[PDB]
């Protein structure tokens, strides 16, 4: 199925624009975005693992896929977030939740399971692959929400509508390129 990330999108919006709300239509559009970008990255990462005869989709294949998919500097920004998340989780002496350990609002355990839907046969999925992908999906969502919230404040409105999402995407040439491809 296409999964629902709305709860976690809202948690990101609370960290980015604590004072700003978001409409139901806007949330549906963001949920489509997350699913679409997930599918593009996961498909490419799984392909990389298969063509290269790897037994596991790892953080290397996610990182490569991010560099093939995200346009311009956005890809390097996103790689840095994935790498940061993996590092935080690793240095986490933790009996905490996987997401909390990596510093993330998006659901690492769920995303690991969803990623397994793209792994053929015996191919496994690594925990760090799922941390890294989670972190990229969260970061992209934060980038859109930051920009759309700023468009809303510019229009003196207190919640994000689809028009603010359009303003956000249309005014950033990398996000515009990403969404046109997706």
């Amino acid at each position: 199925r296409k999964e629902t990330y709305s709860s976690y999108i809202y948690k990101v919006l609370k960290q980015t624009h604590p004072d700003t709300g978001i409409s139901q239509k806007s949330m549906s559009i963001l949920n489509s975005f997350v699913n679409d970008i997930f599918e593009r990255i996961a498909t490419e990462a799984s392909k990389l693992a298969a063509y290269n005869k790897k037994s596991t989709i790892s953080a290397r294949e996610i990182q490569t896929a991010v560099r093939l998919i995200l346009p311009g500097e956005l890809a390097k920004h996103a790689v840095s977030e994935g790498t940061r998340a993996v590092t935080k989780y690793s240095s986490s002496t933790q009996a905490q939740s996987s997401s909390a350990r990596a510093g993330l609002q998006f659901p690492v355990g769920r995303i690991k399971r969803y990623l397994k839907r793209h792994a053929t046969g015996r191919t496994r999925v690594g925990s760090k692959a799922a941390i890294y992908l989670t972190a990229v999906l969260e970061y992209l969502t934060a980038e859109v929400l930051e920009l759309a919230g700023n468009a809303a404040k510019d229009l003196k409105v207190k919640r994000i509508t689809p028009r603010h999402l359009q303003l956000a995407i249309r005014g950033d040439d990398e996000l515009d390129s990403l969404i046109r491809a997706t």
């Binding site: 809202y10 709300g21 978001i22 409409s23 139901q24 509508t161 028009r163």
Partner: peptide, 12 residues
């Protein structure tokens, strides 16, 4: 924003 009038708030 008349546009959005039938677009309810997302509620946590």
């Amino acid at each position: 924003d008349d546009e959005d009038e039938e677009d309810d708030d997302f509620k946590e």
